[PDB]
Design a protein around this ligand. Structure first.
Ligand SMILES: [K+]
Ligand SMILES: [K+]
Ligand SMILES: [K+]
Ligand SMILES: [K+]
Ligand SMILES: [Mg+2]
Ligand SMILES: [Mg+2]
Ligand SMILES: [Mg+2]
Ligand SMILES: [Mg+2]
Ligand SMILES: [Mg+2]
Ligand SMILES: [Mg+2]
Lengths: 131, 101, 151, 92, 53, 59, 35, 300
RNA sequence: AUAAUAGUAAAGAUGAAAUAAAUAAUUAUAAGACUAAUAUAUGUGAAAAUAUUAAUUAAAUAUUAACUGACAUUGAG
């Protein structure tokens, strides 16, 4: 099944804002590819201010690095990833939503589909045929 | 006084045709009565054919259909179809649960 | 490295219930040497300046002006209590920095406080008020309220 | 450091609630009128009153059904009055 | 019509591995497995090709 | 058999374009039974049933 | 174009012509014409 | 038969129109057909519609949408004022000219493919001119077309290897050109939007040909003087020209050097006074509007 | 509810009342229950019921093609 993970990583060090996010993406990506899974895309969303002050593991946060990770894995692996994300102190909020593949095998991230790009081929073919 | 409130004077656009009635107060009142946000459709993503549920990770677009406090606007105000209102409300509720809205 | 407590603004909070009106005047104190402390992260600094400590200066109710029992929740009791507050803010030399007004509920004293602040009684305080806001606390589901009264 | 000092203005107003008004130093009574409009457009006073006492779910449903009907009934009434006025203007 | 060379075989093997992981029955919903079972069962009982009723 | 179709079809198309005849090809001539290594032998190793169906349907 | 297309992302036409001796029976045909 | 007669009846001649009779947006041209009744018929409330128009109506011109409705009334507005705008334009004797120097749309000119060198610009305009098309009916232009275009694959798989084989073996820069031409050549026979709904030229506002001079008892008229009104007392924001109301049209007035002092004096009541203007040129835009340029002739 | 903080003398309740370093304010911690707007229970479900989010499993729609060939309806117990 195709899944779309949206994780809000903590920005502890203002000098290295994109450090825990890279370390976290590698940890999650390794779980997926080591359990028969495929990572289709990793779309960084940048540092954004949280809608409110949020708390996690007896800590407070006012900003986080947003990132999206579209990956293919089994239901059991997807639950394992979610369990690890709900326990990692780095992660402030994490959501995994299923992306239906009943009609087509290649679906882009919701962010891209919102912009009219329904498949990764459309995104790649707009970076080769026109770039 | 050489000044009039904007609400008491009509500014005729350029290139348009007019009648003598367009200088009357009736035109002012008639324009107020029939003043509807009909140009929203062309600027309303959710009235274009996109699925509102694909915007659950884009709080900026979703924030256009909630009040200042975050209350989802009734379909009477948004003017969306039943399906889009249903999908838009789900998107906003999902966005709130993820920690983005 | 040294406590440098300084006032940044004042908060005029009014709680307008059905039976009384409470008016609290507070100072948002900021230790201007907090960033000079050792072992302080960027998050702790930003978190300290996003919710600065507050100190209560004036606390008044309608019973402090002699209104008793049922008269405490009336329009006149709130109007006079608001005046006494606007006077005590000038008699304590607390009208130098900007004031933020926070209203909490919608009892009969809410419109008396507003009238006393947009009128002669609050012609000094209103000049310093920079932001007005509402802080009415609502519940999304939450605890079960008491049963409807059969009267 | 100063990085945490020069980025507190937006941060302070980035976590807004939507129930605040910047007072107009000229007409301070117009800002309180604006705040009241927000309260009424978010039904803050009505919601607070409706949360004072518990109402049974069946009664809540009945009240919601009746209110919707009255809202819809008024829209139908206004539609018919507009037709009357239009008909009168044209001499019907 | 020819006259970027060719892709390394390791890269073409990884494209195959991605396609076989995405299409693995062990990574899909249980309903897909049941759909395959229905086809298998139908073919063991059908009177002729196309007999479904 | 670690040997894969793609790799095997990449040796029958390089040996047929370079002239090399490593014993792997003889083995490949047994893995698939393709004794002769020509451009018209890889095309008959990769034939898909769908192609036959398309012609039966036209008839 | 189908089989005779220049797109990097082609369709099944190209793979069908290959296995149907069309992309080869046309390449020779074009080359024979050039001769 | 009765059906044949009905199709040719005067009511059938009026094209179906459901556009709002009360429109508060920008009006650039007439939207409804004006209906006129004679004085004798007006005396008997006869307009040639289904039902008698109420006697309160004293005008002899109206515009309508529906002959009858569920409210048992006719939907009409007793006004015919777009005709006076057209006749006032005729009295100003300013021919409409093309600012792009295009051929006159009212003459059957022998045109050539000079502009047809943009075959890929307009052949794809059929699928790309979908600014206001449904999200799925516009998507039906993708599969419906693909099948139609995919049915010409065999024809283009032989023509291209018989007319330009070199390009198929060298580069596709020219192949793409042969593709755009192929479809158009195979589409000119087809009928895709064979009827074009775009406004043709002036749209009927003026059928006057430029060139003629106006003879007058005081000699040939060299400059057309028309009374008008200044609407704003401050030039259009972001534009170096004010706005005038001349003959039912809003024009852009250019002043010689300075703005007359009556502007500051009058202020927002400037529209209460009538000035004399000179109509420099009149153009027609694609939206169907008329771009009238004037000049505030001031007594000197 | 508890603790801290300054700040005070009343607070709370009612038709009016009276029974049992506070109230209010700003922080921190804990617990249980509940689910604001959207919202029409529209819809869905056999009924009872069902409206904070996600996931897993199960079921549910229309048309077309092919197939079975009355295999249906109702239903005491
Ligand atoms: K229902
Ligand atoms: K039978
Ligand atoms: K039976
Ligand atoms: K029974
Ligand atoms: Mg009372
Ligand atoms: Mg009790
Ligand atoms: Mg307390
Ligand atoms: Mg709700
Ligand atoms: Mg129903
Ligand atoms: Mg039964």
């Amino acid at each position: 099944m195709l899944y779309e993970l949206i994780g809000l990583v903590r920005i502890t060090n203002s000098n290295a804002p994109k450090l825990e996010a890279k370390e976290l993406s590698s940890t999650i990506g390794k779980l997926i590819i080591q359990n028969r899974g495929v990572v289709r895309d990793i779309v960084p969303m940048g540092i954004r201010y949280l809608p409110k002050i949020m708390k996690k593991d007896q800590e407070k946060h006012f900003r986080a690095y947003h990132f999206l990770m579209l990956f293919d894995s089994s239901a059991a692996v997807q639950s394992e990833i979610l369990r690890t994300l709900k326990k990692d102190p780095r992660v402030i909020r994490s959501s995994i939503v299923k992306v239906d593949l009943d009609k087509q095998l290649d679906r882009a991230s919701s962010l891209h589909r919102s912009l009219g790009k329904k498949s990764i081929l459309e995104l790649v073919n707009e970076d080769y045929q026109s770039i | 006084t050489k000044k009039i409130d904007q609400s008491l004077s009509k500014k005729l656009p350029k290139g348009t045709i007019y009648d003598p009635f367009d200088f009357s107060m009736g035109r002012i009142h008639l324009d107020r009565k029939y003043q509807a946000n009909k140009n929203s459709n062309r600027n309303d993503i959710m009235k274009s054919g996109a699925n509102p549920l694909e915007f659950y990770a884009r709080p900026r677009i979703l924030s256009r259909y909630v009040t200042s406090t975050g209350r989802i606007q009734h379909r009477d105000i948004t003017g969306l179809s039943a399906k889009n209102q249903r999908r838009l409300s789900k998107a906003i509720r999902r966005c709130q649960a993820i920690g983005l809205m | 490295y040294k406590p440098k407590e300084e006032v940044v603004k004042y908060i005029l909070h009014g709680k307008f219930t059905k039976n009384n009106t409470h008016l609290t005047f507070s100072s948002v104190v900021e230790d201007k040497n907090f960033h000079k402390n050792k072992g302080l992260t960027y998050n702790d600094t930003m978190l300290y300046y996003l919710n600065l400590p507050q100190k209560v200066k004036i606390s008044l109710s309608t019973g402090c002006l002699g209104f008793r029992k049922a008269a405490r929740g009336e329009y006149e009791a709130a109007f006079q209590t608001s005046g006494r507050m606007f006077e005590l803010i000038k008699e304590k030399n607390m009208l130098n920095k900007d004031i933020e007004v926070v209203m909490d509920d919608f009892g009969k004293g809410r419109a008396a406080f507003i009238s006393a602040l947009v009128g002669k009684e609050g012609a000094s305080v209103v000049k310093k008020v920079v932001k007005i806001s509402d802080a009415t606390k609502l519940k999304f589901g939450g605890v079960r309220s008491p049963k409807m009264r059969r009267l | 450091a100063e990085i945490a000092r020069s980025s507190v203005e937006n941060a302070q107003m980035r976590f807004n609630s939507g129930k605040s008004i910047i007072v107009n130093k000229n007409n301070p009574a117009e800002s309180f009128k604006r705040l009241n409009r927000i309260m009424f457009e978010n039904n803050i006073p009505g919601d607070k009153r409706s949360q004072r006492f518990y109402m049974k779910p069946g009664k809540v449903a009945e009240l919601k059904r009746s209110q919707r009907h009255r809202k819809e009934f008024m829209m139908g009434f206004k539609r018919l009055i507009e037709i009357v006025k239009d008909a009168k203007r044209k001499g019907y | 019509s020819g006259l970027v060379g060719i892709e390394d075989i390791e890269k073409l093997e990884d494209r195959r591995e991605a396609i076989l992981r995405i299409l693995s029955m062990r990574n899909s919903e249980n309903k897909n497995a049941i759909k395959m079972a229905v086809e298998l069962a139908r073919k063991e009982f059908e009177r002729f090709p196309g007999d479904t009723g | 058999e670690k040997t894969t179709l793609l790799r095997d079809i990449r040796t029958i198309q390089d040996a047929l374009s370079s002239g090399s005849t490593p014993k792997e090809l003889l083995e490949i001539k047994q893995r698939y039974g393709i004794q002769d290594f020509s451009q018209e032998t890889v095309r008959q190793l990769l034939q898909l049933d769908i192609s036959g169906l398309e012609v039966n349907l036209e008839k | 174009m189908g089989s005779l297309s220049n797109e990097k992302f082609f369709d099944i036409s190209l793979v069908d012509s290959y296995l149907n001796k069309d992309l080869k029976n046309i390449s020779n045909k074009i080359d024979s014409k050039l001769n | 038969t009765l059906a044949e007669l009905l199709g040719r009846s005067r009511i059938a001649q009026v094209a179906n129109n459901h556009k709002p009779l009360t429109y508060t947006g920008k009006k650039f041209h007439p939207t409804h057909q004006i209906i006129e009744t004679k004085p004798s018929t007006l005396y008997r409330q006869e307009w040639g519609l289904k039902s008698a128009i109420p006697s309160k109506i004293k005008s002899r011109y109206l515009v309508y949408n529906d002959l009858d409705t569920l409210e048992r009334i006719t939907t009409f507005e007793p006004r015919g004022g777009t005709q006076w705008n057209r006749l006032r334009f005729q009295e100003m004797g300013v021919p409409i000219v093309s600012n792009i120097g295009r051929q006159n749309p009212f003459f059957k000119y022998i045109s050539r493919p000079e502009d047809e060198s943009h075959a890929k610009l307009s052949l794809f305009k059929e699928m790309k001119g979908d600014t206001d098309i449904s999200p799925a009916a516009m998507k039906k232009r993708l599969k419906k077309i693909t099948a139609l275009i995919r049915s010409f694959q065999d024809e283009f798989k032989e023509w291209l290897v018989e007319n330009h084989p070199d390009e198929l073996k060298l580069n596709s820069n020219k192949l793409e050109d042969y593709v755009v031409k192929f479809l158009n050549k195979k589409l000119e026979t087809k009928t895709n939007k064979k009827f074009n709904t775009e406004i043709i030229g002036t749209g009927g506002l003026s059928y006057s040909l430029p060139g003629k001079l106006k003879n007058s008892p005081n000699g040939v008229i060299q400059r057309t003087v028309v009374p008008g009104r200044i609407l704003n007392v401050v030039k259009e924001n972001n534009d170096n020209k004010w706005l005038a109301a001349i003959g039912g049209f809003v024009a852009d007035v250019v002043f010689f050097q300075s703005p007359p002092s009556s502007f500051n004096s009058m202020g927002d009541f400037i529209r209460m006074k009538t000035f004399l203007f000179e109509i420099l040129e009149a153009s027609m835009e694609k939206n169907g509007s008329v771009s009238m340029h004037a000049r505030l002739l001031e007594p000197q």
